[PDB]
Structures are given as structure tokens and as C-alpha cells.
Design a protein around this nucleic acid. Structure first.
Lengths: 63, 57, 342, 71
DNA sequence: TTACCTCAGTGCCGGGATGTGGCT
DNA sequence: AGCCACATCCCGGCACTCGAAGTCCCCAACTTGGATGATTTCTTCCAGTCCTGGTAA
């Protein structure tokens, strides 16, 4: 015991977290896009489901 | 074991000189009827200097 | 008895703070201000010497002002309610001597406290302490309001509420649904005072309905006369709030002295009750009601324990038989202090 | 650990516990005055507690007893 | 009683089974 | 070399994807020259009182 989504959406109830999966995955690709090495990987079709699945798992674990 | 503290004459008398010469942080404690407490307290007019070092809070 | 005997204090309070609410924030402190005033030249030695011998001054010399510096405190315009609160803890700490230099004295003081407990009597002390909380006498000179409400919460889940404290007397009988709360509160306290291993803690708040810019009277500091004439002669007590601002307060021992004003056992004539004191000190009249010359003080009575225990043990109990001397002594042990050279 | 530290000015007045004269006087005097310094604190403590016995008592009962024992 | 004296991913989940390492 | 305990391991099973348009790219952002003088800043009187020693003649 402000206002930015990466701060407010986590402050919310843990049960809600699984529904943020697509947003997290989005940010993830963007973070790669902004990196010197990640320009070869970001938004590549091959990594789509892998990244999304592992994130979804993590969120469920957090929930 | 029961312990009873007592003040050292030599140690207190030296401190009265050092804080004024070395410019240390200090304040003063008053005594009513100085003649009834001792040589040093009387000579100092009932005002005795002590160190003052509070925490940085 | 013996060279050393003493008890610590069993009932201890906190520091009381004044504050008020706004539509914008829940806690705003009441604060003090400082100002220069023009006083009067009046009183003896100002004009007379010796025993009524006028001294030689000219007529115009008393028409001059006497300036002074004081602190003062007023409620600001348009505040409808003022609030005051404090915390209280009570421990069952009169069952054992803090120190005692003699095992034969010790076993006797223990015997007495227990002999008393089982016949009743803690209820009597609890009733008196409880009455003083709910009456509101701990506000001292700030009792003159247009309406006073008192609310108490405790660690056991109870809550008490006095809808209007302005009429509860020391002697008399309280209105229904007030008399009853006094009984319930008495029970919690009577236990807290005598049974160990119970944690008890209370939180007492009150509200004062006031005048447009009414003057408020917080505790005063004890000071030296300044020699500067730029420093206040009358300085008031404040407390630091969690936000760093200062607020007007009442000192712990000033709240305490009020709560223990329960002694109307002297001279078989109740009058008004005294603050418990070994010699029966009376501050208003500057005297003492249990002067050693009368045989009525604590120190004479401390030697009759063997006789008292004998009576308590022989008595049936549950009645009205407990004498003034036994109740007095228990009240003094509750306000523990140094009882040595006995 | 120290969270709050406030210095309080002035000095305490002693209770009138001394009779002016031992007998035939109804006047009370003040024992004397001292010059000290006082403050208000806010603080936390972290105590390293050890239990000698192999089997310990990590229970609600002990948490109540830890609240009661507090001076 | 008194006088004195100080600066196509991914994630669980059951259940019967293949295979292995230490003792005799 | 033969016998026993305990590790995991892979198939059958189960559950999820998940509604549901896209919102413009790129390059430039000012140079020079000056900031005022002359004059004056208050006077009358006042600055409380009492309580809170130990030790030996």
C-alpha cells in the first residue's frame, strides 16, 4: 500500500491478467524492433505462436 | 550485578575547553544553586556545555 | 516493613490532538499563532510598597502601557466541528512489586491483592475510571461547548457512544441507554485491571460543537523568563504530524491527572473527588486533606495490611463491607510510585 | 531503524511529594527542578529470535503472546 | 530557626511400463 | 552373476487458438544596431508580578 498502462494494468486484479496477453505480446515485438539485434526477428511469423503461448502460460501462473 | 554510574571530574572539565576551541556542535545545561553541585559548575556560573549530534532524519 | 518497595504505573494514556475536517481533506490540524500586545500596569508593588505604604511616583506614570508577547489559538471562520482524540492502554500491573527488598513483605502484599480481587472491588475502581472517561472531564477548560459527543472503540470489538456528554454528573443516576453503556464498559476495564495476559487497547475520540471564532486551550509549556523581549512569555504545546506540520495538543500527564480524579473517600464527606495523592493534596486551596497528623495518609495505612487481609479473609464478600481504607490503598497501588523507607 | 525524530523544548514540573515541614504544617513544597532534553520517536525493530527445542511453535497463539509480552 | 553563596500447434494429467543402479 | 526400489517416460486423454478493415511518407527553422538622467527614506512614551536548597551554627 501513475496512469501509464504498464503500471495500471498490473495494479488490477490478477484474474484479469490473462486478457492482456495480446498487448504484452505486441509490446514484446516492439521491444525487439527497437533493439539492434531484434530487427531480424520482430513480428516474424515464425515466432508468433511460441511467444503468445509462453506468455499466456506465464500470465495464468501469475493469476 | 547492579551498576551505579558517576561523572569523571577530569573528563568533563576537558570537554568544556575542547568544544569551544575546536568549534564542535554543542548546547548548555543549567543548574540552580551552582555552589550546591561543585567547583566546576560554580566556576561556569551554572551553565555547562555538552555535545549535540542529532541523526540526519 | 523494608528499605525498598515500589510499583510502576498500571494505566497509561497518549498525547491528544486537535483537528478538523474539510470538504477537500480528512485531517487538517488546528494550529497556534504568536502576537505582540499592550498590557496594563496594575497590581501591588506597581504602586504600593511595604504594607500599603504608597511609593513616590508621578500621576502620569501609571497611564503608560506594558507591552507583552504571547502565543494564542483560535478556531478559524466557518468551521462547524472540532475534533480531539487520544489512545489508552491498560495493564494488570498492580499485582506485583517492581522491586522489594524483603521476602516477608513481598508475600504479604501479594496475599492482599489476591484477597481483594475475589471479593469484588476491581468493579468499584473500574466504575469510577469509566465514569470519568464518558463524562468528558479530560477536556479541562474546553468543556464549554454547544454540544459534546463521545465515541470509544476497543480491541475486543465493542463500541460506545454518548449522544451528549454535557449533563453526566459525578453523583446521580444516568439516563437510560447511557447508564447501560457504563455498565458494559465497566466490565471490560475491571478485567483489564486485574487479569493478566489480556491485551486491551482503547481509542477515544470526541467532537465539540463551537462558536464562530472560539478560543481553544491546549497545554502550556514550563519556561524560563526570556531576556530578549522578542520571545514569548506564554508558550503552548504542539505535536508534529506525519506530514511535518505542527498542531495544538494536550500532554499525556494532563489527560492522566483527569482520569484518576476519583477520591471522594476522605473525612466521610464526599464533596468533590480529589486526584489520588499519598497526602491528599488539594491544589485549589493549596493544602492537604490527609495530613500525617491525622493518621489518614497512605504511610500509616500501609502498615495495617495484616489486619486488612485478616478481615478480607474472614468476610463473606459480594456485599458492601469493604472499608474506605482498603479501597484507598488499592487506588494508590494503581498509581504506582516509590514507597520506600518503611 | 529511524523514521521520525522530533526534539521537544522545555522541562517537566515535579509532583509536590514533599511536605514544607514534617509536623504541624498544612503547606506542600516542590522537591526541586532539573534541566533535561526529550524527544518523540518513530522506529521499527528487527529481532533475531532463536528457539533451542527441535520442535517450534509457529502459531497464531504465539503471535498473541508476542503482542502481550511487549513492554 | 537562620545566613550564605554563584557568571495445425501449445499446456496439464492419468497410468501402466521400460529400463537402470546397488546389495547379496 | 542374480534380485530388488525407484526414478522417469510415452500413449491415450483433455483443453485451448478465435469473431471481425486499414488512419502518410520527406527536407529546411534569420541576419545588424542601441536599455536614461536628479532629488529625497519619520517623530513621542512604555518593556509585570509569585511559588519550586543543603548544611551547619
Amino acid at each position: 500500500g501513475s496512469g501509464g498502462l504498464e503500471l495500471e494494468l498490473i495494479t488490477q486484479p490478477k484474474k484479469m491478467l490473462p486478457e492482456l496477453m495480446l498487448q504484452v505480446a505486441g509490446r514484446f515485438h516492439l521491444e525487439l524492433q527497437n533493439h539492434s539485434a531484434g530487427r531480424r526477428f520482430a513480428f516474424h511469423p515464425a515466432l508468433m505462436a511460441p511467444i503468445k503461448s509462453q506468455i499466456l502460460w506465464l500470465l495464468r501462473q501469475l493469476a | 550485578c547492579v551498576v551505579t554510574p558517576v561523572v569523571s571530574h577530569a573528563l568533563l572539565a576537558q570537554l568544556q575547553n575542547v568544544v569551544h576551541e575546536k568549534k564542535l556542535q554543542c548546547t548548555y545545561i543549567h543548574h540552580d544553586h551552582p555552589a550546591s553541585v561543585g567547583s566546576l559548575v560554580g566556576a561556569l556560573g551554572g551553565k555547562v556545555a555538552v555535545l549535540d549530534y542529532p541523526p540526519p532524519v | 516493613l523494608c528499605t525498598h518497595l515500589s510499583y510502576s504505573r498500571s494505566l497509561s494514556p497518549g498525547k491528544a490532538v486537535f483537528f478538523y475536517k474539510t470538504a477537500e481533506s480528512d485531517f487538517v490540524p488546528l494550529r497556534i499563532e504568536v502576537a505582540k500586545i499592550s498590557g496594563q500596569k496594575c497590581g501591588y508593588t506597581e504602586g504600593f510598597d511595604a504594607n500599603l505604604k504608597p511609593k513616590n511616583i508621578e500621576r502620569y506614570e501609571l497611564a503608560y502601557s506594558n507591552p507583552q508577547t504571547i502565543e494564542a489559538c483560535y478556531v478559524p471562520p466557518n468551521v462547524d466541528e472540532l475534533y480531539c482524540r487520544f489512545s489508552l492502554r491498560v495493564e494488570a500491573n498492580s499485582m506485583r512489586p517492581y522491586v522489594c527488598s524483603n521476602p516477608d513483605v513481598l508475600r504479604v502484599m501479594i496475599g492482599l491483592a489476591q484477597a481483594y480481587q475475589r471479593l469484588g472491588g476491581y468493579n468499584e475502581l473500574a466504575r469510577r475510571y469509566s465514569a470519568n472517561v464518558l463524562r468528558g472531564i479530560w477536556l479541562w477548560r474546553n468543556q464549554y461547548t454547544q454540544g459534546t459527543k463521545i465515541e470509544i472503540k476497543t480491541s475486543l470489538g465493542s463500541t460506545y457512544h454518548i449522544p451528549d456528554a454535557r449533563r453526566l454528573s459525578w453523583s446521580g443516576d444516568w439516563p437510560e441507554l447511557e447508564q447501560k453503556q457504563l455498565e458494559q464498559l465497566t466490565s471490560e476495564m475491571a478485567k483489564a485491571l486485574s487479569q493478566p495476559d489480556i491485551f486491551w487497547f482503547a481509542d477515544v475520540t470526541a467532537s465539540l460543537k463551537t462558536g464562530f471564532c472560539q478560543e481553544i486551550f491546549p497545554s502550556q509549556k514550563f519556561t524560563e523568563r526570556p531576556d530578549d523581549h522578542s520571545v514569548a512569555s506564554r508558550q503552548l504545546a504542539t505535536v508534529e504530524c506525519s506530514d511535518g506540520q505542527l498542531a495544538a495538543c494536550i500532554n499525556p500527564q494532563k489527560i492522566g491527572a483527569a482520569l484518576q480524579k476519583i477520591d471522594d473517600w476522605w473525612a466521610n464527606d464526599a464533596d468533590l473527588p480529589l486526584r489520588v495523592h499519598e497526602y491528599g493534596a488539594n491544589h485549589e486551596a493549596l493544602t492537604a486533606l490527609r495530613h500525617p497528623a491525622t493518621g489518614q495518609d497512605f504511610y500509616h495505612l500501609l502498615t495495617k495490611a495484616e489486619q486488612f487481609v485478616t478481615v478480607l479473609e474472614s468476610s463473606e464478600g459480594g456485599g458492601v463491607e469493604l472499608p474506605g481504607e482498603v479501597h484507598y490503598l488499592m487506588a494508590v497501588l494503581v498509581k504506582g510510585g516509590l514507597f520506600q523507607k518503611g | 531503524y529511524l523514521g521520525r525524530y522530533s526534539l521537544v523544548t522545555g522541562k517537566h514540573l515535579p509532583e509536590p511529594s514533599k511536605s514544607a515541614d514534617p509536623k504541624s504544617v498544612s503547606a506542600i513544597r516542590r522537591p526541586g527542578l532539573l534541566d533535561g532534553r526529550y524527544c518523540d520517536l518513530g522506529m521499527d525493530l528487527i529481532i533475531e529470535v532463536h528457539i533451542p527445542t527441535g520442535g517450534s511453535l509457529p502459531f497464531t497463539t504465539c503471535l498473541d503472546l508476542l503482542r502481550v509480552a511487549l513492554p
